[PDB]
Amino acid sequence: MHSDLTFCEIILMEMESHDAAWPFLEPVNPRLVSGYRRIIKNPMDFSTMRERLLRGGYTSSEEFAADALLVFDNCQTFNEDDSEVGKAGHIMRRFFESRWEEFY
Ligand SMILES: CCc1c(-c2csc(CN3CCNCC3)n2)[nH]c(C)c1C(C)=O
Numbered sequence: 001m002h003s004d005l006t007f008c009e010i011i012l013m014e015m016e017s018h019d020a021a022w023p024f025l026e027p028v029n030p031r032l033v034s035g036y037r038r039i040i041k042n043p044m045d046f047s048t049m050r051e052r053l054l055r056g057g058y059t060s061s062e063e064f065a066a067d068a069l070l071v072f073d074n075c076q077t078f079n080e081d082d083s084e085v086g087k088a089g090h091i092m093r094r095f096f097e098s099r100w101e102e103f104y
Contacts, residue, residue, distance in 0.1 A: 004061040020091035
């Protein structure tokens with residue numbers, strides 16, 4: 001639906017340009033971070049979400065919401081809350097939750 005998807009484009013653009021987005025703009029490189037592929041079974045990032053959105057592959061807003069929440073779930077799984085990626089992820093998670101709620 002047009003209303004459901006256009007809002008997703010707004011929120012995704014805002015998340016990409018957010019100051020705290022730096023840990024999530026491209027996929028994590030498992031060659032570079034010890035243990036990532038063992039622990040995070042479904043990686044996800046904003047650029048993957050952007051590819052899928054432009055491709056047309058999101059049917060409803062809820063699927064979009066699932067990939068978005070997946071970014072921050074994986075973040076909290078792998079990083080401690082006081083790590084730098086951790087802290088950034090909490091800012092990005094609170095931003096997403098609040099913004100999603102002032103649409104739906
Ligand atoms: C700690 C690694 C990590 C990043 C991370 C660290 S640094 C970075 C961007 N880099 C800086 C610019 N040059 C190139 C890449 N992403 N993100 C996530 C979601 C991570 C984990 C383990 O979950």
